[PDB]
Amino acid sequence: QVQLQESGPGLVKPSETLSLTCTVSGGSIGSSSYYWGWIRQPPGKGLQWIGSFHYSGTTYYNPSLKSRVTISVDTSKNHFSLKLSSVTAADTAVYYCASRQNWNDGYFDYWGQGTLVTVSSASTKGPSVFPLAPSSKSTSGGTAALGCLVKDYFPEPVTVSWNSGALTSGVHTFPAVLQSSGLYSLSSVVTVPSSSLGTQTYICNVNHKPSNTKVDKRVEPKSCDKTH
């Protein structure tokens, strides 16, 4: 009945101000007597409350975070906004704007689509591919795992396929995990029998629109097994 839309830059650095906006459709900012509010959820963690705006003009914030956070509203284009002065890298999280239609209390009943905001790294670095080739020393009597790792790229996600996406059965991917250097790594692997290596050549296709980078990597049996 009321829809909330979130908007923000997504990518910043330490020490500037994080600006977020939640707009309201199907209603008004000056709607019935109830709260508006913002909370956050760090990736892979629980939800954390930022603050709430009461319809009478009173505002509430988390006491340990109010020193840098501020909530504002505007009726003219009908939204409310969150500002966090001097954001740090630790604030990377999926942020949600929420509401409580029925009654008036600290609970929240209406929600938008919270957006992930990151504070580290740069958007211009394109991925490189780390081949994961099986070997006879790695084969346990007919079981082999091949794959490709997407490393040194930002921002995630990056689309990874095998033979232009023709190979999807047996393909397994993992959620990307941020490294201390600010880069992500994503593994796409296939579990096969050892005999399939000599019949099909595997091509890992890594495509990244934000960096405009297309990489095709050829997976081959390990070259270290030759008699050099």
Partner 1 sequence: DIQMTQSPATLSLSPGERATLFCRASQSVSSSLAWYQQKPGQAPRLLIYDASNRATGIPARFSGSGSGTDFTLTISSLEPEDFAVYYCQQRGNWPPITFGQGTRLDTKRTVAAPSVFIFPPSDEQLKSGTASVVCLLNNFYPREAKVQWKVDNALQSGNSQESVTEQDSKDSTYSLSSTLTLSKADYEKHKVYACEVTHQGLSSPVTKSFNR
- Sites of contact with its own copies (CB under 8 A): 14-15, 212
Check if the beta carbon of residue 40 is closer than 8 Å to that of residue 50: yes
Residue type, 50: I
Among residues 25, 201, 209, 214, the one that binds partner 1 under rule CB under 8 A: 201
**DSSP-based three-state secondary structure for 134:** coil
Say how far apart CA 17 and CA 34 lie, in whole Å: 28
Q: How many C-beta neighbours within 10 Å does residue 208 have? A: 21
15 binds, among partner 1, its own copies, none (CB under 5 to 8 A by kind): its own copies
Smallest distance from its own copies to CB 13, Å? 10
Q: Identify which of residues 180 and 227 has a Cβ nearer to its own copies in the complex.
A: 180
| Beta bridge mates, 4 | 24
**DSSP-based three-state secondary structure for 19:** strand
57 binds, among partner 1, its own copies, none (CB under 5 to 8 A by kind): none
24 binds, among its own copies, partner 1, none (CB under 5 to 8 A by kind): none
Smallest distance from its own copies to CB 212, Å? 6
CA quadruple 75, 76, 79, 84: dihedral, nearest 10: -100
Binding of partner 1 by 166 (CB under 8 A): no
HSE toward the beta carbon, residue 215, CA cutoff 13 A: 21
Q: Which run of H or of E encompasses 216?
A: strand 213-219
Binding of partner 1 by 224 (CB under 8 A): yes
Q: Identify which of residues 15 and 25 has a Cβ nearer to its own copies in the complex.
A: 15
Check if the beta carbon of residue 192 is closer than 8 Å to that of residue 164: no
Binding of partner 1 by 46 (CB under 8 A): yes
Say how far apart CA 22 and CA 56 lie, in whole Å: 19
Binding of partner 1 by 82 (CB under 8 A): no
Structure-block tokens of residue 53: 């705006």
Query: How big is the chain by its Cα radius of gyration, in Å?
Result: 24
Among residues 85, 177, 193, 209, the one that binds partner 1 under rule CB under 8 A: 177
Q: Identify which of residues 87 and 189 has a Cβ nearer to partner 1 in the complex.
A: 189
Binding of partner 1 by 8 (CB under 8 A): no
Among residues 54, 203, 207, 213, the one that binds partner 1 under rule CB under 8 A: 203
User: Which residues bind to partner 1, rule: CB under 8 A?
Assistant: 46-47, 49, 60-64, 96, 98, 102, 105-109, 111-114, 130-133, 135, 138, 140, 145, 172, 174-175, 177, 187, 191, 198, 201, 203, 218, 222-224, 226, 228
